Design a protein around this nucleic acid. Structure first.
Ligand SMILES: [Mg+2]
Ligand SMILES: [Mg+2]
Ligand SMILES: [Mg+2]
Ligand SMILES: [Mg+2]
Ligand SMILES: [Mg+2]
Ligand SMILES: [Mg+2]
Ligand SMILES: [Mg+2]
Ligand SMILES: [Mg+2]
Ligand SMILES: [Mg+2]
Ligand SMILES: [Mg+2]
Ligand SMILES: [Mg+2]
Ligand SMILES: [Mg+2]
Ligand SMILES: [Mg+2]
Ligand SMILES: [Mg+2]
Ligand SMILES: [Mg+2]
Ligand SMILES: [Mg+2]
Ligand SMILES: [Mg+2]
Ligand SMILES: [Mg+2]
Lengths: 116, 206, 178
RNA sequence: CAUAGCGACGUCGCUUUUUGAUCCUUCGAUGUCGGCUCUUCCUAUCAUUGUGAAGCAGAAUUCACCAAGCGUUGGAUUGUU
RNA sequence: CAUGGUAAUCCUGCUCAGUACGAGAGGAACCGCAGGUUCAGACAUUUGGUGUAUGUGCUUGGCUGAGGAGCCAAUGGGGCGA
RNA sequence: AACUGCGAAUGGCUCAUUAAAUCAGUUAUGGUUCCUUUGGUCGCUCGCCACUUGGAUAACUGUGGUAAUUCUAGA
RNA sequence: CGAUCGCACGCCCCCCGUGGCGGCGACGACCCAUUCGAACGUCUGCCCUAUCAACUUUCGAUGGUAGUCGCCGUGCCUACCAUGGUGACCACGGGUGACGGGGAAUCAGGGUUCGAUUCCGGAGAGGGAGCCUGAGAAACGGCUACCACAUCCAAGGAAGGCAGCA
RNA sequence: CGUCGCUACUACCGAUUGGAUGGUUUAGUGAGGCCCUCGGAUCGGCCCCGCCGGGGUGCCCUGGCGGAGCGCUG
C-alpha cells in the first residue's frame, strides 16, 4: 500500500517485489522481476518487446465541429443600447441615409456657392 | 555544420594546413536533396542574400522538349533508367541533372497527329475512332490540305523513336537541377546520344 | 489545490480553494482542453460542464499543450508556441514546462465553463462585466449593428463616456480605420 | 618508604610445551617435518562476569583472587616450527 | 520421566553527560533505548543461485524432396524460466 | 504602454591561435552575392466588396502559480 | 503585377446636384544600374632548425568524367577512372619569448635589432562544438549542448561569461 | 703533470616495465543542433440541415439554439 512503482514493463510493482537499480549518473530504476532487468541491462527498447505496456500503447492494442458566439455589452453601450441600435431595419436606416444625404446636400450647395 | 571550406584540404605538396579560424557560415553546406519520384513535395530553404532555393524531394511531372521538331510539353516521369554518376541512383530512382529517365509520350504523340496528320504510336489503327477519325480526315479545303501534304514529306521519325512511341515511353535526360530549382526540366534523347545511351542500357542488363 | 474557474460568457473569474481528494478526483487522468462535467465538487456545481484550460505546478511551472506526460520536461521553445516570449527576434530558449494530463501535483487549475446549468453561482455567473472597448474597423461595426452599406457609420460608433472627479465631462470616440 | 610495584647476594621448589643424559620397549617396519581440517582437554587468565590492592582524582595502566563458560582474527615473506 | 546431552556470546551507538572527578587538559558509571559480531536452530514470502519441467523463444552444421513439423551433434550453443 | 519597422554583424578590448597560413603590393570575378543611398521600372499581362475584405493578437480589465528571473497561464 | 500614411486645397458641371478630375510629399516594391562592401581566386615576398631527407595517397592525395552542395569557379563532397602531386632552388616535420603590414631605435655607406600598441587587414570572446533571426553572425553585452570554474535556492529549481568602461 | 684523500658546485649514466604537466590522435560511448521519413495534443472552414425561419413566391433571401456530416479538409 506504499507509494507504488512501475517498471521497464510498466507493470505495477507491489511492495516487497522486484529490485531497484541506481546508476552512477544519478538515475534510479525499478524492475518487477529478473526478466525485466535482464531486458533493461541488455539495453533492449521495451517498445519492441511484445508484452510490455509501451508496446501495447504504441501499437494501440486493446483500446466534431463547434462554433458558438454570444452577445455582451460594451462599456459605453449596454445590451439594450446595442440591440436597439441594431434594430432599425424597417426602413429607419434608409431614413438616416436620406437625412444625412440631404444635410450633406445643403452643406455641398453652401460649399459650391462659397467656392466659385 | 557541413563545411565547403578549402582550408581543411591538404596543400599541393601534401603538407597539413592549420586553420586560422573556425567554421564560417558562408562556407556552409546542406544535405543532398535526393530527389525521388512520386507526388510533388517541394521544400523552400533560405539561402545567402535571403533568396529562395527550391528543394525537390519528390517529383513526377517535368517539362521536356522534343527539340528536333521544337515541341515542348509537360509530361510525366515514369522512372530512372541510366545514371552516369552513380549506379546506385537508378536503383533508388533519383532525379539528378544528368540521369536519363523514361517518360510518358502522350503529349508528343498528340502534337504529332495534330500537326503532321499521320498516325503515330499505333499498331493497326481503328482503336480511338471518335477522335482519330476526325483528326485524320477533317474534310478540309484545298489550302489546308496543301499545307498538310507538303508537311507530309518531312514527316520522318527515326526508327528508334518510332519503336519508343510503339512502347509508349520515351527515355529522356533531365537538364535542370532539382534541389536547386525544384523542377525537373530536360530534353528528349535523339541522334548519336540516343543509341549511345541505348547501348549503355543494353550493356548494364542483357 | 487552487481552482481558477472562469466562465467566458460573463467573465468574473474567481479563485476557488478545495481540499478534498474525493471531490477533485474527477479531473485526474484528463488532458487539457477536455470538457468534463464538474458535478463532483458539491451540489452547487450540478449541471455544469467545465473545460480544463491548463494550470501550474507546485513550483509555478505552467502547463503546455501536446506534451502528453505527467511531470516536467525541457523544450527548446521557439517563437509563438506558449510559455515563452523572446527578448529579441529569433531567440529560442530551453524552458521547463508541465505536461498536459493533470494529476495531484498542481497548485492552480485554470478552468473554463462550457455550458450553463440550472442555477446561478454567486460572484461567478451574475454581475455581467462588459467588454471594455468596441470594434474599431468599419466592417467590424457594420456587422455588429447589421449595417448594409455606408449607413450613418459615423453615428453608429461606440462613444465612451468617462467621468472622474477633476474631469470636466467628455465622451470618447475612436479613430475608425479602413 | 624493604615488601604499591620490583628483589641483589643467597636459598627451597614445581612442570615436562625446550635442549640434554640414558638405551628399558620396538630393526620377520608403530609411515619421519610442516601446513590443512576437526574434536576434546589443562590453567601457569590475554579478553569478557564478580571481586581485593596501588605511587587507584577521572581516564588509562599494574598486582592479586574465585574462575577455562565463551572467544582469542584477516594478510605480505618463508617448506618452515 | 530414570538417565544421557545442553548454548548462547561479545561489542558499538544514543541518553545518562562535557556530568561526577580534575587547577586544567581531559573524562567515566548504574538504569533505559537502538542495533550489531561470533555461534546455534530453522525457513523460502521476498532477493540471489541452480535449472534436463529437456518448459518456451532464438540459433549453427547436418538429416527427413520442400512447407509445416521435427530430430542428431555423449545436455549442440545460447535468452528467459515454474 | 505596446504592436510594427529599423538598429544591435558598427564601435571598443586583446594578440592565444596562425610560418604561403594571416598580411603587403598587383591583377580577376567574362565564376558570385549585396541592407541602405541614388537613378531607372511600377495601366506594357486581355484575364452581389473594389467607395477598401477576413481573422487573430498586443497594449488594457480581471483571476492567479512560483522562493526566485527581463517566467508566465487561464479568461 | 501597391486593399498604405500626411499636407495645403482647388476644377468640371452639359449628363445636371453627386459624382468625375486633379498639386507637394511619405512608405512601398519583382527586376536593372550604382554605392558600401564581402568571399574565393592570380603573380611575387616571411624567422630558426637536417641531432627534421624524403613527404602526400585505404580515411582525396594529383588529375579526368558525371553529378551533389554551396551565392558562385573548384575534390567542396560522392561515384567511376588514371597514378599521380611536392622535394638539397630545402619539400615534409618541429620551434617561435610569431598576429601581418604601414612603421620604431641605432645611423658614413651597407646593415642589425624592435613592431602587444591608437591606421589597414586577420582572429577570439573561459575551451571546443552546433544553430535561429537577418542583406550581412557560426554573433557570444543572441540561443543549445558538453567540459572547467562559479551564483541563489525553500534543495523541487533557476541563473552565468569585464581579451568593453571603471 | 697526473692518481689518491677532504669539502663545495655543475651537468651525465642509471634498475625503478619511475613520476608530473601539455599537445596531437586510433577506437568505443556519445549530449545537442540541422535535414529527411513519420507522428498528430489541439485550433479553424465546407458538408450545416433535428428546426423554427421563408421571398423572388411543399419551392429558404437567412437573421439563432441545436444535434453532429461522424465525411471533405487546412
Ligand atoms: Mg488607415
Ligand atoms: Mg630510598
Ligand atoms: Mg645396560
Ligand atoms: Mg604396518
Ligand atoms: Mg599405526
Ligand atoms: Mg589459577
Ligand atoms: Mg559448550
Ligand atoms: Mg538447424
Ligand atoms: Mg522449416
Ligand atoms: Mg542418426
Ligand atoms: Mg560421435
Ligand atoms: Mg538463469
Ligand atoms: Mg532588412
Ligand atoms: Mg604567441
Ligand atoms: Mg602590431
Ligand atoms: Mg585593428
Ligand atoms: Mg567572432
Ligand atoms: Mg560564439
Amino acid at each position: 500500500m506504499k507509494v507504488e512503482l512501475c517498471s521497464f514493463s510498466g507493470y505495477k510493482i507491489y511492495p516487497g517485489h522486484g529490485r531497484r537499480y541506481a546508476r552512477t549518473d544519478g538515475k534510479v530504476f525499478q524492475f518487477l522481476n529478473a526478466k525485466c532487468e535482464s531486458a533493461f541491462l541488455s539495453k533492449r527498447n521495451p517498445r519492441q518487446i511484445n508484452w510490455t505496456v509501451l508496446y501495447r500503447r504504441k501499437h494501440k492494442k486493446g483500446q466534431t465541429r463547434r462554433a458558438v458566439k454570444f452577445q455582451r455589452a460594451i462599456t459605453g453601450a449596454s445590451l439594450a443600447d446595442i440591440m436597439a441600435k441594431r434594430n432599425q431595419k424597417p426602413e429607419v436606416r434608409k431614413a438616416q441615409r436620406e437625412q444625412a444625404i440631404r444635410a450633406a446636400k445643403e452643406a455641398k450647395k453652401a460649399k459650391q456657392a462659397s467656392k466659385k | 555544420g557541413i563545411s565547403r571550406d578549402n582550408w581543411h584540404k591538404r596543400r599541393k605538396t601534401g603538407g597539413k594546413r592549420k586553420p586560422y579560424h573556425k567554421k564560417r557560415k558562408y562556407e556552409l553546406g546542406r544535405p543532398a536533396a535526393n530527389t525521388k519520384i512520386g507526388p510533388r513535395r517541394i521544400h523552400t530553404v533560405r539561402v545567402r542574400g535571403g533568396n529562395k532555393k527550391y528543394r525537390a524531394l519528390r517529383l513526377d511531372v517535368g517539362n521536356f522538349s522534343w527539340g528536333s521538331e521544337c515541341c515542348t510539353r509537360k509530361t510525366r516521369i515514369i522512372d530512372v533508367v541510366y545514371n552516369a554518376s552513380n549506379n546506385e541512383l537508378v536503383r533508388t530512382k533519383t532525379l539528378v541533372k544528368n540521369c536519363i529517365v523514361l517518360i510518358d509520350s502522350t503529349p508528343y504523340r498528340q502534337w504529332y497527329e495534330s500537326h503532321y496528320a499521320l498516325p503515330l504510336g499505333r499498331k493497326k489503327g481503328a482503336k480511338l475512332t471518335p477522335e482519330e477519325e476526325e483528326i485524320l480526315n477533317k474534310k478540309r479545303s484545298k489550302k489546308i490540305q496543301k499545307k498538310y501534304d507538303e508537311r507530309k514529306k518531312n514527316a520522318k521519325i527515326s526508327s528508334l523513336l518510332e519503336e519508343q512511341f510503339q512502347q509508349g515511353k520515351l527515355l529522356a535526360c533531365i537538364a535542370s537541377r532539382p534541389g536547386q530549382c525544384g523542377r525537373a526540366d530536360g530534353y528528349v534523347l535523339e541522334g548519336k546520344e540516343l543509341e549511345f545511351y541505348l547501348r549503355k542500357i543494353k550493356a548494364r542488363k542483357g | 489545490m487552487k481552482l481558477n474557474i472562469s466562465f467566458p460568457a460573463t467573465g468574473c473569474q474567481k479563485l476557488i480553494e478545495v481540499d478534498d481528494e474525493r471531490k477533485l478526483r474527477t479531473f485526474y487522468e484528463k488532458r487539457m482542453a477536455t470538457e468534463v462535467a464538474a458535478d463532483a465538487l458539491g451540489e452547487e456545481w450540478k449541471g455544469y460542464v467545465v473545460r480544463i484550460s491548463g494550470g501550474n505546478d507546485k513550483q509555478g511551472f505552467p502547463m503546455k499543450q501536446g506534451v502528453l506526460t505527467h511531470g516536467r520536461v525541457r523544450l527548446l521553445l521557439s517563437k509563438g508556441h506558449s510559455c515563452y516570449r523572446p527578448r529579441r527576434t529569433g531567440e529560442r530558449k530551453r524552458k521547463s514546462v508541465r505536461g498536459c494530463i493533470v494529476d495531484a501535483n498542481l497548485s492552480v487549475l485554470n478552468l473554463v465553463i462550457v455550458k450553463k446549468g440550472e442555477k446561478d453561482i454567486p460572484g461567478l455567473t451574475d454581475t455581467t462585466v462588459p467588454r471594455r472597448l468596441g470594434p474599431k474597423r468599419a466592417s467590424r461595426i457594420r456587422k455588429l449593428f447589421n449595417l448594409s452599406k455606408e449607413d450613418d457609420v459615423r453615428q453608429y460608433v461606440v462613444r465612451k463616456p468617462l467621468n472622474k472627479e477633476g474631469k470636466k465631462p467628455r465622451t470618447k470616440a475612436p479613430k475608425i480605420q479602413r
